[PDB]
Enzyme design. Structure first.
Site, PDB file in Angstrom:
ATOM      1  N   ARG A  23      68.171  47.772   4.068  1.00 55.88           N
ATOM      2  CA  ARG A  23      66.930  47.690   3.304  1.00 55.88           C
ATOM      3  C   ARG A  23      67.099  46.838   2.053  1.00 55.88           C
ATOM      4  NH1 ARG A  23      63.188  51.600   5.325  1.00 55.88           N
ATOM      5  NH2 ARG A  23      64.174  53.488   6.181  1.00 55.88           N
TER       6      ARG A  23
ATOM      7  N   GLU B  98      52.239  47.171   2.679  1.00 57.32           N
ATOM      8  CA  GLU B  98      53.025  47.469   3.866  1.00 57.32           C
ATOM      9  C   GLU B  98      54.081  46.391   4.056  1.00 57.32           C
ATOM     10  OE1 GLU B  98      54.152  49.609   5.695  1.00 57.32           O
ATOM     11  OE2 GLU B  98      53.001  49.883   7.550  1.00 57.32           O
ATOM     12  N   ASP B  99      55.214  46.786   4.638  1.00 58.96           N
ATOM     13  CA  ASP B  99      56.276  45.824   4.906  1.00 58.96           C
ATOM     14  C   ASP B  99      56.002  45.036   6.183  1.00 58.96           C
ATOM     15  OD1 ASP B  99      56.505  48.069   6.438  1.00 58.96           O
ATOM     16  OD2 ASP B  99      58.646  48.398   6.074  1.00 58.96           O
TER      17      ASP B  99
END
Lengths: 181, 181, 180, 180
Positions: free
Chosen positions: C166, C100-101
């Site tokens: 991103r 997960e970020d």
């Protein structure tokens, strides 16, 4: 009369299906009179039964559909399946009615039933056209049942043999000569 | 909870539908004599019509379904839609029959037709229950048409208003009072 | 016009990130030395961190990805999401490692954890680059954490604002003029 | 038991990859400076290359991903594939950049390229880390290429054998003993 050539026996006639559909639709309409249920069928087999049942269910309701695929070994032992098409809308707080063609082992159906419960459905019930309780590999009882059948070698009214015969208006059993092909 | 009380006009009765379904089914069975076509329905609206039509089509055929969603502005202009559920099997070399509930602008359906042709279908044809040719934003004529209607404010037999009324056995027009909700 | 002109300040530089992924990868390679885990990323934000993390985890493993969409109210209150891309293989009996970020509210992540548990995973663990404990709307603790940070409107290294930024190699604080 | 035991040779070292990735990023950043392109990866192999490439592309861009499955004969003969995850937004008018790990036959990539053209993309370009142009089963020329390589059985940096080895930081040649 062309595809009837391959049918050894008419197990459940069109006349029987339409009679049972009328009975079940009225029962379901009465049981769900105080809610707007989400009626969902799993592609592809439940489509013919779902169309007939719901249009004889005289009440407000919404429809949706799921598509799933087998993971192989894991699907035969646990019922876990791959979601190819999830519901368009959220399950939380909804009264779910699953429309099914046949329940044999009940593994995949149990997997989906308890998934909707994990997603916090208000209730989950099942109406199945055919029930083969002989084949249960898990404890699953349908809430509405059209007909109890002894084996699963049936075609028609959504049920296929190698993707064919789904478009029969009745449920039948194939001539063994068909299995030789 | 009789749903008829919200219907201002029965545009196409159930009797008419079943009559036209028998006509079309026999025409289609004859035209696809020498091939096993892939009959395709786009969820959700075409489900009841596809059920009736195919079980009155006395020929060998396979069924499949697609699910799509709008991209917003782009869908209204080009018909391009998001594929949520692709066909189970390949299109190359197959005779595709798309079962549609209504053709109005024709953009999304035209997008899918020429998508199947890009995927090298042998042929692509359309049978639609309803046709509203006055709404065309693109040149597209169905090969089989059940009925021609003046407008698209119809519900029943798969067609919805706010996800309701899909489960009517006929095609009707709502009382204006329900648009006020 | 360049992206750095929209960044007010760097919270975690690229160098610091690569130091951390090196540390995390070594821990994960040790904890999973006797199994072939299924490392799962949820699109889109986890992709840059998942790429860097796994090529610093010197051990046998397999990757997969899920794609989900919001149902609206249910997603924001229970975490329930629409599955567009389910895993390519069955979860039953697997050691699942979710990459997960950032864990902020944690609702959707918790929904997927208990989904994998419902699907009878052998174990389900989470490695996250960033952890905002202040944002929680459900009780959820990651098993491996890169950095614990106070609330800032951050972008970069997978994190977006309106689908952009991103591709920054670092995590930076976005200028308020951008996200009024 | 370590992965390098299974590697007969390192075809393209991590150092080489990152130098070329840095070089590709600057070219792409220049070529797309006057548009916000949609950078698309097809899961799963392109993920490590896509992460590094895009964070070395100092320009505004958006990411998306597609997931596809084989239909069997039709896939290996025409490239037609089953869409499991379509793009999150419309293709019409977008400048599409497909990020790919390797182009060998090019059948499926060519199918997706002309699909985006059918969906009225303003432009469709391809950047691939590796190119086996001698393996083509269709006329497909990549707009950006990292390394041109002969016929080898390669793994690493996204490329798998039976879903493993994707997490190598380099591209290596698999020992014949492994895949037999």
């Amino acid at each position: 009369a062309m595809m009837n050539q391959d049918i050894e026996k008419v197990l459940i006639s069109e006349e029987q299906i339409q009679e049972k559909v009328l009975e079940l639709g009225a029962i379901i309409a009465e049981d769900y009179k105080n809610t707007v249920p989400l009626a969902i069928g799993v592609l592809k087999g439940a489509m013919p039964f779902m169309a007939d049942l719901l249009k004889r269910t005289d009440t407000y309701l919404e429809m949706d559909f799921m598509a799933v695929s087998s993971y192989g070994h894991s699907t035969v032992s646990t019922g876990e399946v791959k979601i190819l098409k999830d519901l368009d809308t959220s399950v939380e707080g909804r009264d779910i009615l699953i429309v099914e063609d046949i329940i044999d082992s009940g593994l995949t159906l149990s997997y989906l039933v308890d998934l909707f419960k994990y997603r916090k459905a208000k209730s989950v019930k099942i109406v199945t056209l055919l029930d083969k309780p002989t084949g249960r590999k898990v404890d699953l009882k349908a809430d509405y049942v059209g007909f109890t059948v002894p084996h699963e070698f049936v075609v028609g009214y959504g049920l296929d043999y190698k993707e064919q015969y789904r478009n029969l208006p009745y449920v039948g059993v194939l001539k063994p000569s068909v299995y030789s092909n």
